[PDB]
Design a protein around this ligand. Structure first.
Ligand SMILES: O=C(O)c1ccc(F)cc1O
Ligand SMILES: [Ca+2]
Ligand SMILES: [Ca+2]
Ligand SMILES: [Ca+2]
Length: 436
């Protein structure tokens, strides 16, 4: 009956963020509902040989949601989802959003140790995974959960066994009986993001419908998405970068289409780009290097790429400059964190800004301090530690009061651990990382 706990913005900041129109108090399912009303038959997801329209995505994820409701899963409960880069990922995401189940999307690369830690932390009543994943290849991990009194009530499996509940069976058909359901309230937790770079297993980041939808809408505007955007989803779909910056959710917000790839391997990605005339992609620097190494051979297959976002690791200027020369598309640098703040070079920034900086915040109410070791603001342009708060930056990790008191200051700035300097033009350069 209690909704998932999380650390709230002050009411004065919530009001401000509503007054500015950042927080519009709609569930994240707004993206689907609006697109179904506007363009039900536009393609939402391309996955392998499948073409999911907006109304198909909407009907498939309602089916799953009615099935879960039928089982007493709803507001107050949590789910652990671990799916590869396939359409069912988003069907499941929107299904849990619709049903009011707070979902943690594990990376498909996470193994038993991480999944165990997540299950201990959110005690999910629903687990959704794939039988082709190493961890669910046998029944050992699911069995270990009974021992520890953490068995979920429902396990749905992709590529399922005859014994299992088939995830695709619960998507294909709605429940036999009607049980009511609804999203969690727009200013309550919608789902858990995961931190990057924390010491042990990733820390849980509660995200509300209000703040995630804002970052998605605002990112989609900055990146200039529209209904002809076709975005390659080659990075892990659950990752903040791939999901909201502007990510699949931004593309759906804009009425475009997400094109799935299993991973960023260049030859296969290039084939998907050519086949579906992908015009946007998002990559981390190591994946850009791989593409850069094949792109001359395949210039023709990737001509349609119009925009490449790059972020997630340091991206030297020498490499940035190769993106337009070799990939024949525009560069946008992105520096963000699942905890909130996202920076983009703008599409009309100068070439030097795009090649040498990681841009500037989504929001004019993204507040930045760049501080020395005495936590005093450095002189303009020097390197300091980044601290930030704003309308989509979280206010604390899930159930971690001790850690939270260490990375938030008294004004509720979050200390991301990133080292940065502000350039004269107003943009940020990420130059490193600092501990504790
Ligand atoms: O987590 C990251 O490293 C990351 C990178 C770019 C972006 F736009 C958002 C992000 O969360
Ligand atoms: Ca907005
Ligand atoms: Ca981080
Ligand atoms: Ca191009």
């Amino acid at each position: 009956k209690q909704l998932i706990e999380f650390v709230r913005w002050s009411p004065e900041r919530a009001q401000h963020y509503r007054n500015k129109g950042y927080w519009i108090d709609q569930p994240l399912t707004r993206i689907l509902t609006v697109g179904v009303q506007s363009h039900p038959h536009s393609l939402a997801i391309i996955c392998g040989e499948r073409q999911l329209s907006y109304i198909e995505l909407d009907r498939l994820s309602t089916n799953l949601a009615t099935r879960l409701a039928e089982k007493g899963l709803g507001k107050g409960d949590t789910a652990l989802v671990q799916l590869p880069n396939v359409a069912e990922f988003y069907i499941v995401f929107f299904a849990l959003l619709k049903a009011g189940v707070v979902v943690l999307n594990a990376l498909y690369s996470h193994r038993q140790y991480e999944l165990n830690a997540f299950i201990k932390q959110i005690q999910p009543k629903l687990l959704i995974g794939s039988r082709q994943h190493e961890v669910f290849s046998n029944n050992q991990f699911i069995d270990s959960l009974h021992d520890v009194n953490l068995s979920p009530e429902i396990i749905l499996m992709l590529n399922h066994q005859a014994t299992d509940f088939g995830l695709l069976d619960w998507i294909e058909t709605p429940a036999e009986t009607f049980v009511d359901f609804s999203s969690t309230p727009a200013d309550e937790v919608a789902f858990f993001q995961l931190s990057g770079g924390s010491t042990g297993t990733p820390k849980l980041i509660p995200r509300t419908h209000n703040d995630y939808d804002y970052s998605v809408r605002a990112s989609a505007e900055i990146c200039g998405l529209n209904s002809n955007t076709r975005l390659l989803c080659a990075l892990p779909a659950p990752h903040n970068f791939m999901l909201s910056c502007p990510g699949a959710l931004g593309v759906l917000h804009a009425g475009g289409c997400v094109v799935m790839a299993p991973n960023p391997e260049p030859l296969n990605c290039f084939s998907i780009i050519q086949r579906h005339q992908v015009n946007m992609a998002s990559l981390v620097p190591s994946a850009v290097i791989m593409w850069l190494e094949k792109a001359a051979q395949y210039k023709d297959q990737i001509q349609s790429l119009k925009l490449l976002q790059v972020g997630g690791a340091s991206f030297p200027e020498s490499l940035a400059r190769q993106v337009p020369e070799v990939l024949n598309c525009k560069l946008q640098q992105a520096f963000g964190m699942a905890e909130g703040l996202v920076n983009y070079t703008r599409l009309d920034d100068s070439d030097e800004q795009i090649f040498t900086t990681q841009g500037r915040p989504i929001s004019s109410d993204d507040e930045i301090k760049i501080v020395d070791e005495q936590y005093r603001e450095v002189p303009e342009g020097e390197i300091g530690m980044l601290a930030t708060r704003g309308p989509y930056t979280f206010c604390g990790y899930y159930q971690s009061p001790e850690h939270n008191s260490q990375v938030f200051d008294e004004d509720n700035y979050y200390y991301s651990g990133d080292l940065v300097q502000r350039t004269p033009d107003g943009n940020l350069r990420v130059v490193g990382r600092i501990k504790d």
